[PDB]
Design an enzyme around this catalytic site. Structure first.
Site, short mmCIF file in Angstrom:
data_model
loop_
_atom_site.label_atom_id
_atom_site.label_comp_id
_atom_site.label_asym_id
_atom_site.label_seq_id
_atom_site.Cartn_x
_atom_site.Cartn_y
_atom_site.Cartn_z
N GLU A 174 19.80 -40.05 -32.44
CA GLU A 174 21.11 -40.54 -32.81
C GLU A 174 22.16 -39.44 -32.71
OE1 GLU A 174 20.76 -42.31 -36.64
OE2 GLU A 174 19.92 -40.56 -37.65
N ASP A 175 22.01 -38.37 -33.45
CA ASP A 175 22.89 -37.23 -33.30
C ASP A 175 22.14 -35.96 -33.00
OD1 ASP A 175 25.60 -37.88 -33.41
OD2 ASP A 175 25.46 -38.31 -35.55
N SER A 176 20.81 -35.98 -33.04
CA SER A 176 20.04 -34.81 -32.72
C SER A 176 20.35 -34.32 -31.32
CB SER A 176 18.57 -35.10 -32.84
OG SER A 176 18.18 -34.99 -34.18
#
Ligand SMILES: [Zn+2]
Ligand SMILES: [Zn+2]
Ligand SMILES: [Zn+2]
Lengths: 978, 114, 66
Positions: free
Chosen positions: A724-726
């Site tokens: 997702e935001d990694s």
């Protein structure tokens, strides 16, 4: 001559010259200079006896020995001293000179600091950073910032509509004297809902409402035409008169001044027994607590009548629906209390207590009859510890916060912070929203998120909070320029003439207000009698000229456009280019009447242009009466939003998120971190200045203390570890120094001998003598009980060997594990002359699977996994990305600025330049960036055929890759597993 | 509709009735001043209150930089080509969006709605 | 603080090209020509010199402890 296409460089010479002179904490420093140069003196000289004059030394320290030696701010930081200068006064009875009354903390780099004019060399011979902005106090070692508290403007009539209650309309006026001797005293004048709607006056020190005509008769206007002449300036207005008819009846019984004064005194706080005593009570309450800004005297009654008639008339104009009700969020109606007003308010009380106690002491001695001896009658600790306590604690709460030293931008953004209160005025307005009037004066993006969204704000870059002035030069000029007072006029002339207020108090009337505004402007544009920070609004429809010399009016500089041509000619730019070896600065541009300071309510009479190059060029006419011009429209952004590149391509939630995360990026936070033993410093190894940078970053010193590294970023789904935001990090880059960090922590302990016995002492405990509850490990200590610099300390390991004597041990261990290395062990003595020790340990922090990184376009992500260089997708040149981020992050956030930053960054790294991401450019498209990227042999849109690092096969879709500036957020994971 | 003021104490004259001739007097309540009225009206409440705003707008607004100017609306009084239009913005007549013009030539200031 | 050895991405040694870069910029070469003269072809390596802030030159202003 005029500047036609050289504008965008003229634009930025004028802004460079602004920030060369002022700086970014100019409001803090100017406010404290005003306090310490004017307000302390006019506070002692407004004390009723006697104290003559005020001297202030340079900050001095006296040891247990006793000797005046200067203290430098670093020796104050280290030894936990307060950086404070002594205050001397001259008292008269014989007469005494330089009687020491207290110690005043000195704001750093202000006129009374020891670092005031020092050059950058001698700032480094004192171990101070030449880039440190100053504007904070060193109080007991801590660096304190006085957040600027915003509040409603005093002395002006605000007519609001009470939703329900019993008043349809209410017009308040918080009045405060010139030198705020006694606090503000609000008076209300309301009109009841629904004979007819009668008007009542809610006075201070009176528990019931009072018919307004009663208060006009208590002033000595007995008749009834002599009360409407003060309220209704045009008697041929039959609609406004029938609104006062219902109120000239509630006060029909009372037809004389003394029965009215009795009517008022019968409602006071102390309803006396005698009619004469109640009359005198009401007399002094109307004479001192009703509208004190109009005057406190024995003849300020035909001015209080005029002003109360003004408040009533303006309430009627609102009720008749002839004037808009006042906006409680408009910033013309607000004032910001900085370190000057806050500290002067805090010093009134303490000088008051100093007087109270010198009286209470000397009275005992001289009514005994021996002698007073004033000079031991002075308890200096009143002033000293009062100022120091109210600054060290913040309880004046939320003023005086500890200065944030995580980044340079975090620091600069702390010293330019406002604070909208959520007290009674936050209960009535919408204080969390962005008002139209914040334009250019508060940053629209920078706000916290969560429970304080919109309550804490930040100044724009060129916004300046005015420091205060004296209206006496203006008042004399006004008298000399054919303005009639409020005594030498007949209320028949007051009708079609222009009111003239100066600082709220209605001062006169003028019959030619056009020529008067021309004259006052022409004078302020030369700094003859009117200083540059004086506001002069003209309500053309309301027929008023309001003139402000208050303190706390936020303003901003604007180019003057006479007719339709800038007054900034090409010669001003030619003289500012040579700003060195010419002595032509900002002030020679202000004083040339070519730049003005406009504040938020003078800003409603102006007709701004955004750019000369477009707005004042003849076309199909929109406006052709422009009166000012923006220098650059990107000066509407604060310090942390001037880092975002291309912020006009992001959605504002992203500008806000990044503004919040530019304050968490590690970097170098200050140059002399080598001597500063803060708790918790984070220092990046190899910071880099951005390859795509705003022009407003040249002044935030972000090329010199930068907070981040230019990553090569591929926007690609690689193995799912960027979910997702990694992000996926290169393990080889991380081995080569990428985003490595140092983390310092200081531990202090003092060897206090407080009681007779039970003395704490530094000594190696272990198995020496008289042991107590010795715990795990005590073998790295030296024989003085202190660990030595350069030893490796692990979890639950002893740092300071203190024993509190048959001796208990109160040794200091590391904060629950980190395995650092002891960096610096400084030994000194605190104020008490006890031994004192600060120990700084150092821990290197290599990015890991948990650490959080974020772009300048507002979304942060942990590191999902780290692949070595051979596992990363490569290019046909062998350029493996440093960060791989997920594609499904970009669309949902409107951050096209991230992709334009990658594209412009690729062009800048290939071209050998540093790209311009300034917001409102119009000389930088995406088409112009693409046509330059396709000249260095790349795909014009930044895509690039990547190969799979695992199997070597091309990836069917071309990956978007390029250099983007990434920040290592302060969070990480070493701080949670310990 | 208006206020009458006494001629001795200058307080307000309240209406009263004259029985012996049945005529409306205005009499002061701090004197024996009386005045045979000429109105025969005591109180007028205008609820719909059709108001002229050409009378509230002062000609000085033709000195506003922030106000939009015009050319295809010459002043009928002086024939000056320019004008300065704006709206009411008054809680009573804020419903309509009618434009008022104020001739911008000096010494004229002739208001007019169209 | 100081120029990194080894471009982060590729690993090519840029840590002996800082004084040469400065010397070629004071002999009036545009930065794109100073970087081509040091033989830094890939933009990954050119941003290591292009975007470097030499802070060890400012930390050498404070006198040592001894
Ligand atoms: Zn009378
Ligand atoms: Zn006309
Ligand atoms: Zn490389």
């Amino acid at each position: 001559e005029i500047t036609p296409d050289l504008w965008q460089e003229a634009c930025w010479i004028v802004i460079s010259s602004y920030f060369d002179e002022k700086g970014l904490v100019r409001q803090q420093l100017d406010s404290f200079d005003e306090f310490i140069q004017m307000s302390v003196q006019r506070i002692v000289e407004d004390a009723p006896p006697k104290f003559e004059q005020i001297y202030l030394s340079k900050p001095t320290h006296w040891e247990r020995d006793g000797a005046p030696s200067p203290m430098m701010p670093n020796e104050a930081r280290l030894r936990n001293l307060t950086y404070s200068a002594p205050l001397y006064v001259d008292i008269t009875k014989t007469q005494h000179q330089k009687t020491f009354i207290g110690k005043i903390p000195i704001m750093l780099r202000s006129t009374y600091c020891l670092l005031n004019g020092l050059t950058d060399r001698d700032l480094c011979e004192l171990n101070e950073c030449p880039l440190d902005p100053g504007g904070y106090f060193i109080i007991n070692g801590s660096e304190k910032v006085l957040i600027a508290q915003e509040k409603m403007a005093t002395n002006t009539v605000y007519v609001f509509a009470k939703k329900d209650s019993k008043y349809a309309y209410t017009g308040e006026c918080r009045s405060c004297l010139e030198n705020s001797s006694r606090p503000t005293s609000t008076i209300w004048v309301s009109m009841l809902a629904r004979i007819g709607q009668r008007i009542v006056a809610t006075l201070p020190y009176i528990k019931q409402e009072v018919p307004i005509i009663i208060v006009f008769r208590a002033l000595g206007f007995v008749s009834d035409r002599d009360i409407l002449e003060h309220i209704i300036y045009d008697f041929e207005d039959p609609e406004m008169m029938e609104m006062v008819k219902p109120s000239l009846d509630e006060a029909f019984v009372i037809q004389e001044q003394n029965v009215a004064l009795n009517f008022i005194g019968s409602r006071g706080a102390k309803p006396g027994v005698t009619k004469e005593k109640r009359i005198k009570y009401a007399k002094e309450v109307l004479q001192k607590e009703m509208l004190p800004h109009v005057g406190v005297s024995d003849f300020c009654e035909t001015k209080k009548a005029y002003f109360l008639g003004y408040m009533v008339h303006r309430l009627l104009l609102a009720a008749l629906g002839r004037r808009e009700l006042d906006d409680r969020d408009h910033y013309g109606n607000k004032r910001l209390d900085l370190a000057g007003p806050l500290l002067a308010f805090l010093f009134r009380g303490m000088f008051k207590n100093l007087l109270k106690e010198v009286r209470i002491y000397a009275q005992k001695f001289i009514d005994r009859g021996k002698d007073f001896n004033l000079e031991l009658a002075i308890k200096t600790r009143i002033i000293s510890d009062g100022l120091k306590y109210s600054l060290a604690t913040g309880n004046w709460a939320g003023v005086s916060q500890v200065l944030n030293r995580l980044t340079f931008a975090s620091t600069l953004s702390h010293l330019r912070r406002l604070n909208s209160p959520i007290g009674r005025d936050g209960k009535l307005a919408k204080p969390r929203q962005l008002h139209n009037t914040l334009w250019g004066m508060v940053c629209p993006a920078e706000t916290p998120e969560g429970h304080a969204v919109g309550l804490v704000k930040n100044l724009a870059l060129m916004a300046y909070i005015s420091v205060g002035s004296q209206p006496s030069p203006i008042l004399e000029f006004l008298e000399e320029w054919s303005m009639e007072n409020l005594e030498e006029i007949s209320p028949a002339a007051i009708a079609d003439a222009t009111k003239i207020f100066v600082n709220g108090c209605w001062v006169g009337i003028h019959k030619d207000p056009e020529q008067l505004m021309n004259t006052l402007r022409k004078l302020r544009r030369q700094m003859d009698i009117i200083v540059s920070e004086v506001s002069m609004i003209r309500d053309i429809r309301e027929r008023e000229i309001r003139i402000y010399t208050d303190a706390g009016r936020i303003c901003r500089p604007l180019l003057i456009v006479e007719k339709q041509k800038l007054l900034l000619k090409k010669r001003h730019i030619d003289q500012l280019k040579e700003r060195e070896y010419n002595n032509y600065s900002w002030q020679d541009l202000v004083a040339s009447g070519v730049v003005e300071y406009i504040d938020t309510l003078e800003e409603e009479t102006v007709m701004l242009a955004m750019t000369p190059d477009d707005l004042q060029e003849k076309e199909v006419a929109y406006c052709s009466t422009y009166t000012h011009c923006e220098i650059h429209p990107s000066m509407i952004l604060g310090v942390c939003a001037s880092i975002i590149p291309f912020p006009d391509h992001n959605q504002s939630p992203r500008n806000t998120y990044q503004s919040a995360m530019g304050k968490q990026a590690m970097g170098v936070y200050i140059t002399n971190f080598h001597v500063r033993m803060d708790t918790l410093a984070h220092v990046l190894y190899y910071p880099q200045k951005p390859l795509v940078t705003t022009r407003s970053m040249e002044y935030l010193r972000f090329r010199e203390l930068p907070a981040g590294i230019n990553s090569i970023v591929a926007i690609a789904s690689y193995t799912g570890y960027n979910q997702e935001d990694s992000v996926i990090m290169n393990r080889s880059a991380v081995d080569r120094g990428f985003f490595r960090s140092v983390f310092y922590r200081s531990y202090k302990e003092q060897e206090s001998k407080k009681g007779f016995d039970q003395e704490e002492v530094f000594e190696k405990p272990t198995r020496e003598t008289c042991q107590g509850m010795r715990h795990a490990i005590y073998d790295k200590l030296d024989d003085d009980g202190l660990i030595a610099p350069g030893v490796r300390v692990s979890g639950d390991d002893v740092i300071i060997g203190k024993t509190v004597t048959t001796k208990r041990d109160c040794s200091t261990f590391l904060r629950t594990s980190e395995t650092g290395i002891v960096d610096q062990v400084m030994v000194t003595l605190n104020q008490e002359g006890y031994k004192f020790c600060k120990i700084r340990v150092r821990s290197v922090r290599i990015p890991q699977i948990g650490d959080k990184f974020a772009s300048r376009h507002g979304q942060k992500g942990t590191c999902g996994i780290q692949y070595r260089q051979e596992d990363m997708p490569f290019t046909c040149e062998g350029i493996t990305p440093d960060i791989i981020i997920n594609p499904h992050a970009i669309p949902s956030r409107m951050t096209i600025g991230h992709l334009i930053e990658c594209l412009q960054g690729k062009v800048s790294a290939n071209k050998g330049e540093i790209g311009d991401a300034t917001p409102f450019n119009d000389a930088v498209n995406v088409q112009k960036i693409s046509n330059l990227l396709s000249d260095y042999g790349y795909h014009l849109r930044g895509n690039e055929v990547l190969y799979n690092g695992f199997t070597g096969r091309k990836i069917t879709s071309q990956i978007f890759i390029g250099p983007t500036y990434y920040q290592r957020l302060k969070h990480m994971v070493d701080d949670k597993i310990h | 509709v208006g206020i009458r003021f006494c001629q001795e104490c200058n307080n307000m004259l309240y209406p009263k009735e004259d029985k012996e001739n049945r005529i409306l007097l205005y009499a002061c309540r701090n004197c024996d001043y009386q005045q045979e009225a000429d109105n025969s009206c005591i109180y007028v409440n205008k609820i719909t209150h059709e108001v002229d705003e050409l009378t509230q707008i002062i000609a000085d607004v033709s000195q506003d930089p922030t106000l939009p100017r015009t050319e295809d609306h010459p002043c009928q009084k002086c024939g000056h080509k320019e004008a300065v239009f704006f709206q009411s913005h008054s809680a009573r007549a804020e419903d309509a969006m009618r434009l008022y013009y104020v001739c911008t030539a000096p010494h004229c200031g002739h208001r007019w709605t169209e | 603080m100081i120029i990194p050895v080894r471009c982060f991405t590729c690993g090519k040694i840029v840590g002996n090209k800082w004084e040469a870069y400065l010397g070629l910029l004071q002999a009036e070469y545009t930065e794109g020509d100073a970087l081509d003269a040091l033989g830094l072809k890939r933009y990954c390596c050119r941003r290591m010199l292009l975007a470097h802030v030499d802070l060890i030159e400012k930390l050498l202003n404070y006198a040592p402890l001894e």
